[PDB]
Design a protein around this ligand. Structure first.
Ligand SMILES: [Cl-]
Ligand SMILES: [Cl-]
Ligand SMILES: [Cl-]
Ligand SMILES: [Cl-]
Ligand SMILES: [Cl-]
Ligand SMILES: [Cl-]
Lengths: 171, 171, 171
């Protein structure tokens, strides 16, 4: 019957003018790392920025990875709305996307940096929720990467999440 | 069948002369945040100081909150022995207590800082266990706030806990 | 159906050339402290060093402890392959081992530092896996302490673990 188990990170954000920082910190310490992550996003991104609903869970590899690593990633992990994998450089800058279907057609020794999809777009974290939902919905993608204003890949948004956003903005 | 799951934070305190700090730290890292909190209190407050049995779980709001926030706090959280809410300033200094019964009689736009109970007492963390138990038992309160020697609200003690303390000091 | 719940700390190590540090850090933050410990060992010790398979779970006391503490440790904790307890100085340097059977024959007021077993060996963390397994198997011990190159007791290896290592190095 616990207290901090009864408050969401969103509650904390919404009540940031009224709760002592001490209380917020004890709440954060008692929550899951996933919930702390949600709090940091809500704290950085306002209610109509897609950054706020970004999911850090994703398939990502550095620009040193090969087809062999990508194939193994897709085979070893089960993830909702996933059929792409994101490539970053050593400063975490998003470089591009490789697709599952294409990467099972290449040789395993091939660097992923040489097989980046020509179609691949990323959302900026400041994109509006409805522009985000449109961008995923009217494409052939089931997820899109999200980058911050420094170019760093911070996470992804899924087609499933876009559906929620839309249905929210009806109700 | 785990080891650090078999040792309480109290065990660690009691054995602080005999366990390497390295062992204590690994134990603390493996425990829940609630258990780490218990350890810090036992580490700071000796066996006959009420600080040691202080509960950080409480209804608290800053002096910027209104009746509207207080009403919503009481309605959204279920907490043992709770019918008061504590107001602190921006340096976390305890200012006073508002009671549930009174705050459901005021207008929601009213600042809590203007409705502090005249009756409201706080225990100092160094109060003896039996003086603490008496103070809660022979009052009309079911909980009291505890402050440190800097004036900061560090937590509360409940009527239920006081009962335990008493029954302990019989046995 | 979570992602970081699907990757072991060993996976992370094996894929350290290919995952962004950002991804590794989020994975580590989401895992248990035990799993983070496993990662630090794999990160420090290579595949044929016993340090890598060291268990931090152990009975250890400082050189200020008495027989009374040791007796109580053995009686209050259930631990796999355990019938020894390790004594360290205040800088965590391994000094020696006391055995359960012997310490139940001494007076409780006696300092453990005066009852160190003459037989007691420790493995260096760089010992090969098969030399480690041999050392435990062909002795009268069911566990051995492991020390780092600074002399610090970092953990233990059990007879059970040695069996695994052997059976691994067959298959
Ligand atoms: Cl691989
Ligand atoms: Cl695998
Ligand atoms: Cl409110
Ligand atoms: Cl609510
Ligand atoms: Cl003892
Ligand atoms: Cl005990």
């Amino acid at each position: 019957d616990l207290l901090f188990a009864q408050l969401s990170p969103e509650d904390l954000i919404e009540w940031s003018d009224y709760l002592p920082e001490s209380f917020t910190d004890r709440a954060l310490a008692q929550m899951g790392e996933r919930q702390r992550q949600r709090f940091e996003l809500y704290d950085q991104y306002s209610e109509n920025e897609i950054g706020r609903y970004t999911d850090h869970q994703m398939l990502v590899l550095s620009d040193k990875a090969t087809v062999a690593q990508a194939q193994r990633f897709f085979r070893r992990i089960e993830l909702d709305c996933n059929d792409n994998l994101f490539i970053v450089d050593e400063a975490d800058k998003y470089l591009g996307t490789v697709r599952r279907y294409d990467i099972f057609k290449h040789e395993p020794h091939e660097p992923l940096i040489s097989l980046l999809s020509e179609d691949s777009r990323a959302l900026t974290a400041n994109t509006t929720l409805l522009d985000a939902a449109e961008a995923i919905e009217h494409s052939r993608e089931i997820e899109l990467p999200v980058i911050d204003d420094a170019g760093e890949l911070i996470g992804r948004v899924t087609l499933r999440a876009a559906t929620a956003l839309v249905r929210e903005h009806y109700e």
